A paper describes a structure:
Chikungunya virus (CHIKV) is a mosquito-transmitted viral pathogen that causes fever, myalgia, rash, and severe arthritis in humans. The E1 glycoprotein participates in cell fusion, whereas the E2 glycoprotein binds to cellular receptors and initiates clathrin-dependent endocytosis. Most neutralizing antibodies bind to E2, as this glycoprotein is more exposed on the viral surface than E1. We also describe pseudo-atomic resolution structures of CHIK VLPs complexed with Fab fragments from four different neutralizing mouse monoclonal antibodies (MAb CHK-9, CHK-152, m10 and m242).
Residue numbers in the entry:
A (entry chain A): 1 to 217
B (entry chain B): 501 to 717
Amino acid sequence: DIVLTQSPASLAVSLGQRATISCRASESVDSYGNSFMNWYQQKPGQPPKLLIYRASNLESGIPARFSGSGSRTDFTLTINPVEADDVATYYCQQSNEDPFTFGSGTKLEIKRADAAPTVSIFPPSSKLGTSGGASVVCFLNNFYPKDINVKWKIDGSERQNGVLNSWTDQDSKDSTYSMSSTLTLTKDEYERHNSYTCEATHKTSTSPIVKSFNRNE
Amino acid sequence: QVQLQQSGPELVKPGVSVKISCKASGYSFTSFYIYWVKQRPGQGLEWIGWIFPGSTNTKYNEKFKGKATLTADTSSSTASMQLSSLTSEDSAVYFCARVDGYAMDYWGQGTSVTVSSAKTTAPSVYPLAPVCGDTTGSSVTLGCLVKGYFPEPVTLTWNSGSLSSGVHTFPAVLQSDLYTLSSSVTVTSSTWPSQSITCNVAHPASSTKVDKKIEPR
């Protein structure tokens, strides 16, 4: 009912620097005398955690580095300095009237030194062959930034059918990303070809990291 | 110690109502408001309605009025929400929150409801040992493949939870009405295979607790 918009939608801030988050309102929530604007921190898989209520007053247990301000419709939350465990989507909510509404979302991400992924290729297990399946797994662990492309090659030729990808959220300590790719194939298709290469291009190096295995062993 | 304990995950067919419980402990149940919040996967937060455990007093969001009903039992100190005839746009994470005017102080874990009209399928656990060949050295990675299951979630554990520091758990991605999820653990070469590293996989719907030891191929 009362629209709350957050700017920007996503911000990148280096460790130890200042981050500014805005929350615009369609109606003045500060009515009657005091501001009824709350702030929340939500890490993936976890419920939102209340940081600051009424724009100014912080909740007990929350560090003083989390600071909020604003009145009427324009409200701002700042974190100074930022830490590795600040990776979360931050929300502003309003009380006042009439059905309670949350903000819009603003994802916080940390900029750090560029890291190269440690690539590890895994052949299908012996129990996969008995079931009739064949999944070749490839893990890309601890790298920055998030932008990465994985290309599967079977016997020198690229394969894009049956590729399953999943990206992790930023680490609460390392502030790094991780990705896993799997070739969902059948036993009939697996035994016909020999070489399987996992290839990944990144900003850290022009040469792609190629990890491969042969079925012949 | 104020706590809110919500129920487990839920799989429902379209056109079936469901009750979601929220157990409260550590405070006087009848003296505080309890708000309920909906979260569409990969989206923002939605306020559903509040309930006062003292007596029958509720106010709902106009978008949820004819769908959500709130009840509270004083003797068991549990807040319960019923959601009538669930659709595709109802598959979300529902939260219960303790509110002391006018901010949500304490939260539950959140119940993940999925609809979803597919059959519940058993997960298949596959151990991922390093590429064939008697070791490589330095620091080797181990993996665990969970292929073809329904529905969410799957709780992944390594050695009952002792070696849970260098673990990368990947979010599940749906393919052809089936979920797939992987986990990788990176350990030093000195502690493998001298120390036995096991993969603990648990699934609620199929009621399966498959434990698999990763042994060199």
